[PDB]
Design a protein around this ligand. Structure first.
Ligand SMILES: O=C(NO)c1ccc(Cn2ccc3ccc(C(=O)NO)cc32)cc1
Ligand SMILES: [K+]
Ligand SMILES: [K+]
Ligand SMILES: [Zn+2]
Length: 638
């Protein structure tokens, strides 16, 4: 199993710059690279990454995406003086050339291919390339928008040719539309391209009609190009997460890519002079995290744009933190996307509904300042495991088995006050472990999450929940797989209960989400539908301080690892899972996902039952006025 994160960088890519006056071009500067690397070094992140060297892309590699005529033309720019470079630059839009830019372009491209090789060879889990010049605007025969050669396009074409991959996802979260990537894979269903971008009704550069939501691809590629235009500036964390939960992720997990490549422009971050969006650097920690369960974690992040040197360094750090598996920061203040984003989201979902299952829409009808991000630190041990007495297991290197007298006195207090007749000395053991791991998770910063196997469900849950609330945990998200009633009160706003059950039951609290999924071959696709489109939107808005997972002993959850992995985007990754009864496999799967191991892909699934989609949309209707992040349409105004 692959481990580690590659960081691919070279100061040579900082050795070209703009050589004449041009206020529009002067934003793209060498310091973008140096500020990004130095931020990674300052925070100790570069030192934790494998420093794979850059190389030049070969001529044959450049020819995968560009014409001989265009390559030959750019190959002559090293020999040009400044007058000649300016004249060559004016043949293209929004791009400048320099004696060294052809050299650097070949390095930016080779760097990306090195990243692809390291990930696909399993030499690292994932990685990031800090490159100049950017790539995603460059085309078959044109430089465009500071881009010379299309780095991310090369990476997908190279991965197809040399690793015979059938499905590649490209996620372009730069604030500009990567039209060069769109054109490259327009007719290609093997490479799914997603882009959000500032558009403003085509008035924002590059001002293309085909950057709109209606470009879904051509021919066999129809449905494999997804454009999400932002028609207002000021988009927030909530808008970006709505885009992921209600557009990108449902398609990504159904597509089931074999490799994820990210066109990572951070000009979509707050403070950027080109993007003028309002999302915080912390959001990129979660954008990265939400994609990591795809392709067994094989993710290649490639730097595109980003022009506020402060915003840029912080967003690069948040991304690498997540690649290294550090705990995600808590996102507060989430709610509904704005109306213009909901309109863009509504429109993309509708035009894409002929290609993607979950999008169908009827029933039978169809100076800027922001706070510095907090420090993100991996816990001493990530995952504590407490299997039944007398069960020793092989644990991953960042897990550990679990009982002091302070703790022992507390279990005594709890028994005498709340369970008078309880004397099962094994239950009293679990209760001592529950309190002990929670104390390490919450107050100690030494442990991140934990799994405890339990026998008595009610006393275990009550002790876990009540003890967590006084840690203090202002809010606790409970995720319960099983039927029956739990000793959990959801009446004061401190607890949200997600219940995956088998019996259909009436929901009356807006602090509860009950999912009765019809048993069948389709339970997997429906659960993933609910996870990305219902559970995660509410969980992120709730913003809990702790997640409490509970699984009763009463087989069909080939979904648990994805849930465990994605739900660690909440509560800085602080999740306590209580498994009722010993299941060797479920315990090993739970520990593996809790500890940050890569997740096995889901592959293909029978599309969800209409009864399930109906049940889920009734939940969204019932909950979205309280929990606006659930909205994937514009509200109907009175
Ligand atoms: O790559 C980017 N971000 O990551 C990126 C790409 C393009 C631009 C805008 N831009 C930059 C020089 C320039 C010149 C003319 C025009 C023009 O023709 N305007 O109408 C536009 C221009 C900004 C950033
Ligand atoms: K984009
Ligand atoms: K495509
Ligand atoms: Zn950009």
């Amino acid at each position: 199993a692959a481990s580690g994160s590659a960081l691919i960088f070279d100061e040579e890519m900082s050795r070209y710059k703009l050589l004449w006056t041009d206020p529009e071009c002067e934003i793209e500067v060498p310091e973008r690279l140096t500020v990004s690397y130095e931020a990674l070094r300052t925070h100790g992140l570069a030192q934790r990454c494998k420093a794979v060297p850059v190389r030049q892309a070969t001529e044959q590699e450049i020819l995968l995406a560009h014409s001989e005529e265009y390559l030959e033309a750019v190959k002559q720019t090293p020999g040009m003086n400044v007058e000649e470079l300016m004249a060559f630059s004016k043949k293209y839009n929004a791009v400048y050339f320099h004696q060294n830019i052809y050299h650097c372009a070949k390095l930016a491209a080779g760097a990306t291919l090195q990243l692809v090789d390291s990930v696909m060879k399993r030499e690292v889990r994932n990685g990031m390339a800090l490159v100049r010049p950017p790539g995603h605007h460059s085309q078959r025969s044109a430089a465009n928008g500071f881009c010379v050669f299309n780095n991310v396009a090369f990476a997908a074409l190279y991965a197809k040719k040399n690793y015979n991959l059938n499905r590649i996802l490209i996620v372009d979260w730069d604030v500009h539309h990567g039209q060069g990537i769109q054109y490259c894979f327009e007719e290609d269903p093997s490479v799914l391209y997603f882009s959000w971008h500032r558009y403003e009704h085509q008035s924002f550069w590059p001002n293309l009609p085909e950057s709109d939501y209606s470009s879904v691809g051509k021919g066999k590629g129809s449905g494999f190009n997804i454009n999400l235009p932002w028609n207002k500036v000021g988009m927030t964390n909530s808008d970006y997460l709505a885009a992921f939960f209600h557009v990108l992720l449902p398609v990504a997990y159904e597509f089931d890519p074999e490799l994820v490549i990210v066109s990572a422009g951070f000009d979509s971050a707050i403070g950027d002079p080109e993007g003028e969006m309002c999302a915080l650097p912390e959001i990129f920690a979660h954008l990265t995290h939400l994609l990591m369960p795809l392709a067994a974690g094989k993710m290649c992040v490639v730097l595109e744009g980003g022009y506020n040197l402060t915003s840029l360094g912080q967003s690069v750090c948040q991304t690498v933190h997540s690649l290294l598996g550090d705990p995600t920061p808590r996102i507060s203040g989430l709610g509904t996307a704005c109306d213009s984003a909901l309109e863009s989201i509504q429109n993309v979902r509708n035009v894409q509904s002929s290609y993607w299952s979950s999008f169908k829409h009827l029933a039978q009808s169809e100076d800027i300042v922001w706070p510095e991000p907090l420090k993100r630190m991996p816990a001493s041990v990530r995952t504590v495991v407490v299997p039944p007495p007398g069960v020793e297991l092989t644990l991953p290197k960042n897990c550990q088995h679990s009982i002091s007298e302070s703790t022992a006195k507390e279990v005594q207090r709890i028994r005498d006050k709340h369970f008078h007749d309880l004397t099962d000395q094994n239950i009293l053991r679990s209760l001592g472990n529950i309190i002990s791991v929670l104390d390490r998770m919450m107050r100690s910063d030494e442990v991140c999450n934990g799994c405890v196997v339990v026998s008595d469900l009610s006393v275990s849950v009550q002790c876990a929940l009540q003890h967590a609330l006084t840690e203090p945990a202002e809010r606790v998200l409970v995720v319960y797989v099983g039927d029956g009633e739990l000793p959990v009160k959801t009446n004061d706003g401190k607890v949200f209960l997600v219940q995956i059950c088998t019996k259909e039951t009436e929901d009356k609290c807006v602090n509860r989400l009950t999912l009765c999924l019809r048993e069948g071959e389709s339970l997997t696709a429906g659960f993933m539908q609910a996870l990305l489109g219902l559970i995660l939107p509410v969980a992120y808005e709730f913003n809990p301080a702790l997640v409490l997972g509970i699984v009763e002993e009463t087989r069909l959850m080939r979904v648990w690892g994805h849930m465990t992995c994605l739900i660690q985007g909440l509560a800085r990754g602080r999740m306590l899972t209580l498994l009722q009864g010993y299941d060797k496999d479920l315990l090993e799967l739970t520990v593996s996902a809790l500890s940050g191991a890569s997740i096995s892909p889901l592959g293909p699934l029978r599309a969800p039952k209409p009864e399930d989609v109906e049940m889920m949309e009734k939940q969204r209707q019932r909950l979205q006025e309280r929990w606006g992040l659930l909205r994937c349409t514009v509200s109907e105004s009175w």
